[PDB]
């Protein structure tokens, strides 16, 4: 008796004092005091300030600067693109149920919301799959007589939204479900519920295979990989001072996105060894939903790693922001 079953919700509280409420119809306060949702509301008034701008500024430079429209760079447009989903469909959304202290757009914004909150987050992780790809073709050169053009570019934008839509859109259909979760103002999966009507279970498996396990897998291969090949080529070219400097800069920038990256990946490998062991307890209003809570940080660091780091954008940004001038 963990918490509130109701149609199309798991409240992660018990109703044995009969307090609890719908979270489509009236506030949560049970599962957290009112300044406690405030402070959800300011940490998304924190990630619209931020994400919003650094997001816009990327897709806003590249229109300004021919330098930067390069086929290598679609992806991390689709990047900029991605995050400004979650930043309009989840934070956003997410900033005004909270001041509300639930999720007042009912069942149906509730799909809504979790569609594009998910979709959002899961094209921009493929975008760094697909990205790890590209450099790795590029550089450790796989493929014999191969060229990496416009048409590639395309697909592997299109491939991001094949597999976003491959988790976002079977919750609409019957495939799990998009339920309020944690403190009940943003919509998601249905991590919380054995729900048997829409085979919970095996879309948790499919998520934790399919997009959780692959993508670690493709990124730690293609950027080790690289990281090999760079090194290989520098060591017989050691005379390079410049070759030498290019080596480390290089494998410098691959631990920092791998890093980032496991610190997005790390917590939700963490909660779901507290859930293969110590299956038994509860789990508060914040358990399983601290991996999401911090991985909307990605929506920031993400662009300031693979765009606000490239020497290319950098500059074009500082042209475009200073009226054209230094
Ligand atoms: C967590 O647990 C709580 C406690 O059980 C649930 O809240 C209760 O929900 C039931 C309905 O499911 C509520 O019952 C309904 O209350 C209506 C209003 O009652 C108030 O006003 C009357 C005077 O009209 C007072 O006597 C009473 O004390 C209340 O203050 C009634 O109009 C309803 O009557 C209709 O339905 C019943 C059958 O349930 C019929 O017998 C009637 O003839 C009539 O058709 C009904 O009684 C109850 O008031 C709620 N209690 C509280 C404390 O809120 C939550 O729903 C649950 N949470 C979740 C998420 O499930
Ligand atoms: O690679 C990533 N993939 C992500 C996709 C996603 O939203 N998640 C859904 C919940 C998920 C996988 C992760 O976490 C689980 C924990 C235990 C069992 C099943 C699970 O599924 C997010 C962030 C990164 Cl870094
Ligand atoms: C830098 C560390 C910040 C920690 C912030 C913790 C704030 C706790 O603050 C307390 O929280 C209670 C919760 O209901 C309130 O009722 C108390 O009035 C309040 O003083
Ligand atoms: C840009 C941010 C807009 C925030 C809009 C918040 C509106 C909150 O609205 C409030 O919700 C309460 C229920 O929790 C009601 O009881 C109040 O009557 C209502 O004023
Ligand atoms: C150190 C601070 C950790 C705070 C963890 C808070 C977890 C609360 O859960 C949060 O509820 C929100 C409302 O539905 C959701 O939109 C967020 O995705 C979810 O993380
Ligand atoms: C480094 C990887 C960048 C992308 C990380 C995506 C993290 C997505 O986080 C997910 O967001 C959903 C919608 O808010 C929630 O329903 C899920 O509970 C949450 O895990
Ligand atoms: C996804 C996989 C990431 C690969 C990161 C490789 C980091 C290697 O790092 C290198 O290791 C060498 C070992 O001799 C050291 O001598 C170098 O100083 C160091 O740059
Ligand atoms: C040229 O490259 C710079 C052009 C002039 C820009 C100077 C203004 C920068 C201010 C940005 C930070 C504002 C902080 C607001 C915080 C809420």
Known sequence: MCGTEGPNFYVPFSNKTGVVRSPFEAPQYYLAEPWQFSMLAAYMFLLIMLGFPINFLTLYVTVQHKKLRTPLNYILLNLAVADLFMVFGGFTTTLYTSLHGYFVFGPTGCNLEGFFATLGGEIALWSLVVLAIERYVVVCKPMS??????????????????????????????????????????????????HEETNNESFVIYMFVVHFIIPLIVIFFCYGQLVFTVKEAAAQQQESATTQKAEKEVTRMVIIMVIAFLICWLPYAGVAFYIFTHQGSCFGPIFMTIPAFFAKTSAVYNPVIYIMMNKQFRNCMVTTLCCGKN
């Not at 990496?148 to 976002?168: Q, S």
């Not at 019957?174 to 943003?186: A, H, K, L, N, V």
């Open 145 to 194: 007589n191969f060229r990496f053009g416009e048409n590639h570019a395309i697909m592997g934008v299109a491939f991001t939204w094949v597999m976003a839509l491959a988790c976002a859109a079977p919750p609409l259909v019957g495939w799990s479900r998009y339920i309020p979760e944690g403190m009940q103002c943003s919509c998601g999966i249905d991590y919380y519920t054995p």
